[PDB]
Design a protein around this ligand. Structure first.
Ligand SMILES: CC(C)[C@H](C(=O)O)[C@@H](O)C(=O)O
Ligand SMILES: CC(C)[C@H](C(=O)O)[C@@H](O)C(=O)O
Ligand SMILES: [Mg+2]
Ligand SMILES: [Mg+2]
Lengths: 369, 365
């Protein structure tokens, strides 16, 4: 009669926080607070656990992703990551660079489905370098295959041939089952939006893309409410500039996903607003802002926390099925922007320039009202 | 005099869609510009792409490769069409394009992306961002994942299909494209940005390593490195920051097309593919546009400018190349626009009429 579960009708989730490097800890600290407050309003409690990753892990135990961090992440209900990278580690051997830890945690958590929404918010339309009429109303979702393809393909390496010359190689490889699963996510995703899915590949050159297109095509019959189309990656790169409003959902591989989602991100004009979700089958998902560790403003209360806050909303929605709590966060971010609040990266003439903590305070204020 | 005329052999590969229309115009413009410099051409038309598939059942006939290799330069129209997209992999039009690039060993692909002042409004980027864009992509054209082995679709023991390709570069392949790009930047504004994914891929670690080692051979050139995903963003945010970019086959394909659309006018952009020895390959970057094939709507200016790159880079005919460039400029300054570049207050014309306007500007001089 109090509700499901064993704590007075409340739901308690275990969250692993991976603040990381640069501005990561600052923005995660704020999102944590917004998460707690919005959750509390829906009868949701959290056990948080901070663990090291990236440069922080390197300075601590000499690897970018400690076994103990993986264990903690795997035993959790969801993972919220801050940011990865710094100048200090830039002359390290490549297994000892912060980015390595990020690739390793994706693989370890088997979060093959990366969701990256790119929307132009009406309050920030003028931040885009695209003309207003082209940028306004952009609202697309890139579904990127995150744990396969060339990023993780074998064989790979740099070797010296018999002529004494170096040869570097990587393998773009996909098994049918890897394509099917990311395709299914994208079809389900498009179904819940405008019902349009664009599969992006290089099928006029690459056998790996021919298989991609074959499997995606064969799945279309299981989603008759979804209009499937296909586009070559180079044409997709042009169409994002020419008419980004044409897209609802895009599905593509690891490397094309990396390039196109980042292109779509910059087209919106405000990188500091953009969240992302990485989902697995049945295990904890990984949620993180798409921006970097921005080391040059670290510790200066300058960072935009909104992308991480919105990643926490994605954590609630996609990771935990806690939709009302997610909506409370999304609403509060909107109220802050409507009230004229802007951190430095989204500042325009006549708005209220605020620091990181102060922006969090405004979101918090709105959640609690 | 007849004895002292300069003569070149040009192989024409009209290809598919609007390819034949635009190449026919560029051929005429080429003849007229050259003749004013005492240069005459022997043209031979050969099949490639869908056109070769329809004639002999392969996208690149042996006879075409022979003709191209024996010539001084190759001018190509366009490849591809819906007619052949349901073809087996070995028999799609595009395979012919990859095959001719490989056969001619044209590893150095030059794709200049500029915003013309007459056409600044055609970009979807704000005027202040698009105006003054002027970059060159130097793309490695005959190596990398496009040609790497092993490759295929196989069925494993379980009956499950696995599709795979190999991104592979030997150091000397990187060295050679890099040298071309350094030399390119030196002739431009002295800035080179090398683009890779060296934070993930071994092949790109070698890429960055070789380009870095070569920097000291061109100490007058300013070299920087950028990840391909960052480059895709920087082209949107501040494309004016770039002079010359060098990158591999697949990143070059993506980034150059992104840069092209950023300028706003795909129908204006030429390209050159150059080899160490032998004829170069010159073609517009637009596609076959099969919906307007035979409708006299095509913009011939990109192929006309590709013929200018042919003269300039392939044949060293600098004065003839300038005559063509000058004439395209005259035609645009006279207000002529094909449909793809039309704006209110201009003269909307078809393909043939645009060509004739460029032709009479050439012959004016
Ligand atoms: C840092 C890099 C390894 C990473 C990637 O390529 O996935 C980043 O670019 C991203 O998009 O999250
Ligand atoms: C294969 C073919 C479609 C070609 C390529 O990918 O190189 C085209 O995109 C280009 O840029 O010339
Ligand atoms: Mg990226
Ligand atoms: Mg292309």
């Amino acid at each position: 009669q109090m509700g499901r579960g064993s704590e007075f009708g409340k739901k308690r989730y275990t969250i692993t926080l991976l603040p990381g490097d640069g501005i990561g800890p600052e923005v995660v600290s704020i999102a944590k607070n917004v998460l707690q407050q919005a959750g509390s309003l829906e009868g949701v409690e959290f056990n948080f656990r901070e663990m090291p990753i990236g440069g922080a892990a390197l300075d601590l135990v000499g690897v970018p992703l400690p076994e103990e961090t993986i264990s903690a992440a795997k035993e959790s209900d969801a993972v919220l990551l801050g940011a990865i990278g710094g100048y200090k580690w830039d002359n390290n051997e490549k297994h000892l660079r912060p980015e390595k830890g990020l690739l390793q945690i994706r693989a370890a958590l088997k979060v093959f489905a990366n969701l990256r929404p790119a929307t132009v918010l009406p309050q920030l339309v003028d931040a885009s370098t695209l003309k207003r009429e082209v940028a306004e109303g952009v609202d697309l979702m890139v579904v990127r295959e995150l744990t396969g393809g060339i990023y993780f393909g074998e064989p790979r390496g740099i070797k010296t041939n018999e002529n004494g010359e170096e040869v570097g190689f990587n393998t773009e490889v996909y098994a049918a089952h890897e394509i099917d699963r990311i395709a299914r996510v994208a079809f389900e995703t498009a179904r819940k939006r405008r019902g349009k899915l664009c599969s992006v590949d290089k099928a006029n050159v690459l056998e790996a893309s021919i298989l991609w297109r074959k499997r995606v095509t064969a799945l279309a019959s299981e989603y008759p409410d979804v209009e499937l189309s296909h586009m070559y990656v180079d044409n997709a790169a042009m169409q994002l500039v020419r008419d980004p409003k044409q897209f609802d959902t895009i599905v593509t591989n690891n490397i094309f996903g990396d390039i196109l989602s980042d292109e779509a991100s910059m087209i919106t004009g405000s990188i500091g607003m953009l969240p992302s979700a990485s989902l697995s089958d049945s295990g904890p998902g990984l949620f993180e802002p798409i921006h970097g560790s921005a080391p040059d403003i670290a510790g200066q209360d300058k960072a935009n926390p909104l992308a991480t806050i919105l990643s926490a909303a994605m954590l609630l929605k996609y990771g935990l099925g806690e939709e009302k709590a997610a909506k409370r966060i999304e609403d509060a971010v909107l109220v802050a922007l409507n009230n004229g609040f802007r951190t430095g990266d989204i500042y325009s003439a006549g708005t209220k320039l605020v620091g990181c903590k102060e922006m969090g305070e405004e979101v918090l204020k709105s959640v609690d009202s």
